[PDB]
């Protein structure tokens, strides 16, 4: 029960923006992962303790208020697939997936 933009397009070699909006964005971070055609998802972003999460793999993410941001790195050449969103609920019970984006 969350919101994600299904289709955003941006210029290659430039920065991009992914959003996922919802209420329980206070209980358990965000997550995303990427879905290549016919392949299993991979960790786009992780959390090892507190702030040191986005950092220097590239990417980086920001959490404004209701919606969060996945400010990705500068180069965007060919790293294109479908992106979702994970996260848990305020009572930790269950997990909701609310679709996600396919960038080109």
């Amino acid at each position: 029960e969350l919101t994600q933009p299904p289709s955003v397009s941006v210029s290659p070699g430039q920065t991009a923006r992914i959003t996922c909006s919802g209420a329980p964005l206070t209980s358990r971070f965000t997550y995303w992962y990427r879905q290549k055609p016919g392949q299993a998802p991979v960790l786009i972003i992780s959390r090892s303790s507190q702030r040191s999460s986005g950092w220097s793999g590239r990417f980086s993410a920001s959490w404004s208020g209701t919606t969060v941001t996945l400010t990705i790195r500068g180069v965007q050449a060919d790293d294109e697939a479908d992106y979702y969103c994970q996260s848990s609920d305020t009572s930790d019970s269950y997990k909701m997936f609310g679709g996600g984006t396919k960038l080109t």
């Binding site: 206070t26 971070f29 507190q50 702030r51 959490w63």
Partner: protein
């Protein structure tokens, strides 16, 4: 080991515990009397949470 004696004790009406009590209080206050008083610490405090993230 006092022999043949059967003296009666009382641990609730015993005054060694009350002497103990008023000694610690006067001993604690004597160990704080000569130090830094923090009277200036009473101001309006503007505070925030920490890393809810």
């Amino acid at each position: 080991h006092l022999e043949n004696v059967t003296e009666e004790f009382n641990m609730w009406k015993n005054n060694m515990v009350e002497q103990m009590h008023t000694d610690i209080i006067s001993l604690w206050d004597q160990s704080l009397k000569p130090c830094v008083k923090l009277t200036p610490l009473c101001v309006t405090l503007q505070c925030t949470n920490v890393t809810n993230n």
